[PDB]
Design a protein around this ligand. Structure first.
Ligand SMILES: CSC[C@H]1O[C@@H](n2cnc3c(N)ncnc32)[C@H](O)[C@@H]1O
Ligand SMILES: CSC[C@H]1O[C@@H](n2cnc3c(N)ncnc32)[C@H](O)[C@@H]1O
Lengths: 235, 232
């Protein structure tokens, strides 16, 4: 397809810089505190947004990206804290869906993590997921697919981590933007998929590990997005 | 001037929607915005839905599609200040996320990277609110309002908020996301909400009993505030 535009969202400069550097005929849109780089990745039109950290920042950015750029699909990239036992720093996690691990209106009968007016979780697009898995296989990378949960806190072991494992025993990774992006996408009916890499395991060593392994995570997730954009656009 | 107003629930915005004349409706991103005049003042009323993301998406659409000069966030809230009773008013001096924590990276508790630790509400909007409160003989408290994506009802939830923000006068779920979006677009804002519960273990029961009263009181304050801002 020669008419599609793939949207990509990363929260930090370290997470979008590799991709930004590969954009052909790049230009930059500066709006509401966010930056969006337009151009093409090996011929495929893309709109890469640096959203900032956290749920609100990502929502605000995701909304602007959809409104000003109208991408057909959205891919959220960057690093995450690994929760699945087989995950090691560098490994890829693909979202089957996204849920807020810090949303709680259970007092009114909603299931934990669900906000009023929203489904309890947001489902990633089946085709995007299948495409991401193909890339994972073609690149011979270790990955895990499943539930990714977001919140506005950096998980670093202790109660923060345990509470999450307890409410979401099946969660494979934790971060701070995916569910806000999926929430916005859901409201606009835009297909999305989260493809991040592991930089820590959200335990008490998470900050030490994050600082040490963010670059390798950025590299691996960036490689995956580059490969995914190509696959989604031409097969 | 065009005054932006944001409420989360139908119950919080319905009284106001009923008063908007030359009324039109914008439906987008799962949100509804009612435009027109309120007692002779141009307004844009957004029903955002509950939570930070819904409020952030809503506020972003409102600014971009309606470009109001200022924003007023209304609705009910859980009172934390000792002198608040159900129905009373809380006015924001400032808004802070009570559930944001990146302190592992040196940011202040509640502060997200790239943002000020707190979002200061507009002095003139605050002054005007305080004027209406005095003119209406209402009981109110002004100060820090904290937002999170959890309904607070005693226990650990309430204890953690008391620990990090002992000066918080109220707690709710949209104010700071709205302040955060307004910050990014240089738009003045203020929070004027009415109490429906005191965020203790009986907060769900109080909420259900008093949301109607809180919606009414908050709606009246907004109506008076809008009129004062546009006509003295
Ligand atoms: C510096 S704040 C952490 C940033 O990296 C992601 N992240 C990586 N590991 C973690 C973790 N263990 N807890 C929370 N967010 C994480 C988040 O989405 C946010 O953009
Ligand atoms: C049904 S979820 C509660 C809704 O009312 C407000 N609210 C009122 N009291 C409280 C409370 N005690 N804790 C959290 N949000 C509250 C929130 O902003 C949200 O829109």
């Amino acid at each position: 397809e020669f008419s599609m535009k793939i949207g990509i969202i990363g929260a930090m400069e370290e997470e979008v810089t590799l991709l930004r550097d590969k954009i052909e005929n790049r230009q930059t849109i500066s709006l509401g505190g966010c930056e969006i780089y337009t151009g093409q990745l090996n011929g495929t039109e893309v709109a890469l947004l640096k959203s900032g950290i956290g749920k609100v920042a990502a929502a605000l950015g995701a909304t602007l990206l959809l409104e000003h750029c109208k991408p057909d699909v959205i891919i959220n990239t960057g690093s995450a804290g690994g929760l699945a036992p087989t995950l090691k720093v560098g490994d890829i996690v693909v979202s089957d869906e996204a849920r807020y691990h810090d949303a709680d209106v259970t007092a009114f009968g909603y299931e934990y993590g669900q906000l009023p007016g929203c489904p309890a979780g947001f489902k990633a697009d089946d085709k995007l997921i299948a495409a991401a898995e193909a890339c994972i296989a073609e690149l011979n990378l270790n990955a895990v697919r499943g539930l990714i949960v977001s919140g506005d806190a950096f998980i670093n072991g202790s109660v923060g981590l345990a509470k999450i494992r307890h409410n979401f025993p099946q969660a494979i990774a934790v971060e701070m933007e995916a569910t806000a992006i999926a929430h916005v996408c859901h409201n606009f009916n835009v297909p999305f998929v989260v493809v991040r890499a592991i930089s820590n395991v959200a335990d008490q060593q998470s900050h030490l590990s994050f600082d040490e392994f963010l670059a390798v995570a950025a590299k691996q997730s960036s490689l995956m997005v580059e490969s995914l954009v190509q696959k989604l656009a031409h097969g």
